[PDB]
Design a protein around this ligand. Structure first.
Ligand SMILES: [Cl-]
Lengths: 421, 416
């Protein structure tokens, strides 16, 4: 009777994973992150979390940072101090002894690599690069005085050559990093353990386990719009590798999807709206970067993209958000296919130059006028709004399990309980 | 659904080759999901490196998933190798998202090792750095040229300034490798669509790991590991299929442990028992000629492998090698600085201090190479096999009493 749930955005972020994650967190017994670094979820139990999973506020819930993450131990301690200063207990935290460690040379490397390009702040990329190269320092290494110093000496030998000779800049001595960072590790040691054992024990004993993806599917390093992606795998498959659990133990995957598409980046965007409709969707949907203030690009729901997400991330359940934003639009469109070089295709091209030539083939649906912001069940939707929601499910092949008609908690309507099998 | 993953549970040489050859006969699709052109067991002898095992059967679709790194020149050599021997390859499919190994990756590989080699590591590093060139880029004249220009602008600084050595001009690589792409184009497609189609229509699909679980970049003896994830979870990421579509995972274990590297090896035997196992088991590198280290079965390692690779089925191999050893041992825990533990330490300095705590079982004396059923095994050999399964938590699905195919005894059908 396995009871695990993965929650992930199906698009390029800003899908509203936050509200759904908060909900599923309440009913979880264990909550785990499985990839990424100190990237941010904004809750008021006002709190913002970066590395620590969202179950931390509940004393009884075990929170796991899996082996798939890269951890800045300094930033992690800042995040812990932040919680403690707000009266939040963190004894429920578990940190993987196999997670990789972000060190000061990763931050400098990050800056230097970014400034050399003409086409990335916290050293996450460089940490993942060291992992692939097999020179990375792991949490277990940081906890060993002799091993930490030795790997630090070996890596700085190479990193300092890179800084001094390729980038004409100062490197780091071993003593600028060693005692400072060893001490950080000592403060984290109480949480460090075999997290694969922790998770498998919880899973095998039928506990409710929630895995939280940090970025959206289209930002996946393998399956997203590479290279404008994150440096890891937020797809549900990433859970298996990122925490060390078998694929048979990941039961349900909730894909969080918005009723329309949004993008922050500048890449190809088949269903983009440049007109008054996109203006209305943007204004009503408040599609502006919360920290940057920059407007997001908006466009129609793209079911080619979402079916792609269903395949690569094994989506089983759909949470459809921001449905209210489409009110008062007489003709709604959903992209069902792409016209490319004169051919009709149903795949997301891996080549962005090909993605850029893709014109959407769309279904038109009639819109509605009623304020659906008060709606609390499918039966309360006006006919055209329900038919729109049903069509999204039908087109994507994913069963509806939640829909949202506003930003509030009570405006998330549960159609199906994803913890029960 | 009817999908199987086959993976070595140890550090290679478990004998997954026999097991893969058997499962690929009943498979309709065979797929690779990680690694590069750095594998292969003999299968008229054939050695495959990048191309999955099903290629010899015209009607079986063979897939190289998005999780691999592909040296296009090497792949064409492998294709030619097969064609020269009458083997059709129309059944091959290559991910349009697989990453491409280029000549600068090979030089970088050499330079990096000399500082402390098929460019597999450097190609995974470039993937992580998001500057990698993918199969879809290689097929695009303008894209390839542009990405090559950008990358060589950085790689040439690395080479000239850090390694005081020559780099590559764009033209040294462009025309040669674009040509290679044009020869591979016919096979290139969305392999996630291909596999999900095969899976949804109930076809038998086999995924084969390239290295053992203890060489996994996350879960193995880091840093002495491969540069990707041969664990069964690697299938989800490496081919773009959901966890729910990976139904059975066969862990291939040898009845005792072997290692090639010189790192920690808790159950290592240095005595006459080690000598007997090495000789009877032919525990030498087939290419290097070098003797492998051998030791008792280690269930601490295999329980770790069960967790991290979601093993559902056990293939136990080379059981006949343990014949004639009166007292057989299985390690079930480690004593580590006076503490008794049952996890594999993530830190190698700690693993190096692990002393085995062992169960002991009586051996057998009879030749078992002709045995074709659990019921025909001598008592103490059946007991040993059963105990391995009891201690690791993995049900027995195959066992082997010799190198030949007919000495692979099937207990359950993993495709059912
Ligand atoms: Cl080894």
């Amino acid at each position: 009777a396995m009871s695990s749930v993965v929650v992930v955005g199906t698009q390029w972020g800003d899908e509203g994973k936050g509200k759904i994650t908060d909900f599923l967190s309440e009913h979880a017994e264990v909550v785990a992150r499985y990839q990424g670094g100190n990237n941010g979820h904004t809750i008021v139990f006002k709190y913002k979390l970066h590395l620590i999973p969202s179950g931390i506020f509940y004393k009884e819930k075990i929170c796991v940072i899996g082996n798939g993450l890269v951890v800045d131990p300094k930033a992690l301690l800042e995040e812990l101090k932040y919680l403690h200063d707000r009266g939040v207990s963190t004894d429920n935290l578990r940190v993987s002894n196999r997670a990789h460690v972000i060190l000061p040379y990763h931050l400098k490397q990050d800056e230097l690599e970014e400034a050399s390009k003409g086409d990335t702040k916290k050293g996450i990329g460089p940490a993942y690069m060291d992992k692939a190269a097999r020179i990375g320092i792991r949490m277990a290494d940081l906890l060993d005085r002799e091993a930490f110093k030795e790997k630090l000496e070996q890596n700085l030998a190479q990193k300092n050559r890179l800084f001094e000779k390729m980038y004409d800049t100062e490197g780091f001595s071993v003593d600028e990093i060693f005692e400072e960072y060893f001490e950080y590790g000592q403060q984290i040691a109480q949480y460090v353990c075999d997290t694969s054992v922790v998770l498998n024990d919880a899973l095998d004993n039928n506990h409710r386990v929630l895995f939280e993806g940090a970025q959206g599917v289209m930002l996946d390093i393998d399956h997203g719009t590479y290279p404008f992606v994150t440096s890891s795998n937020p797809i549900a498959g990433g859970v298996t590798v990122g925490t060390g659990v078998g694929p048979a133990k990941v039961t349900r995957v909730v894909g969080v999807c918005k009723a329309y598409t949004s993008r922050v980046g500048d890449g190809p965007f088949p269903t983009e709206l440049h007109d008054e409709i996109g203006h209305q969707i943007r204004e009503v949907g408040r599609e502006y970067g919360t920290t940057t203030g920059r407007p997001r690009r908006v466009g129609w729901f793209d079911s080619v993209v979402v079916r792609h997400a269903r395949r690569v991330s094994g989506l089983t359940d759909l949470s459809l958000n921001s449905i209210d934003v489409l009110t008062g639009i007489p003709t709604l469109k959903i992209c069902v296919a792409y016209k490319c070089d004169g051919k009709v295709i149903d795949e997301v091209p891996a080549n962005l130059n090909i993605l850029a030539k893709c014109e959407p083939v769309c279904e038109e649906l009639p819109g509605w006028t009623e304020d659906i912001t008060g709606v609390r069940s499918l039966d309360e939707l006006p006919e055209n709004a329900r038919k729109y929601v049903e069509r999204v499910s039908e087109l994507t092949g994913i069963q509806l399990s939640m829909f949202s008609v506003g930003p509030d908690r009570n405006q998330t309507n549960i159609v199906r309980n994803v913890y029960e099998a």
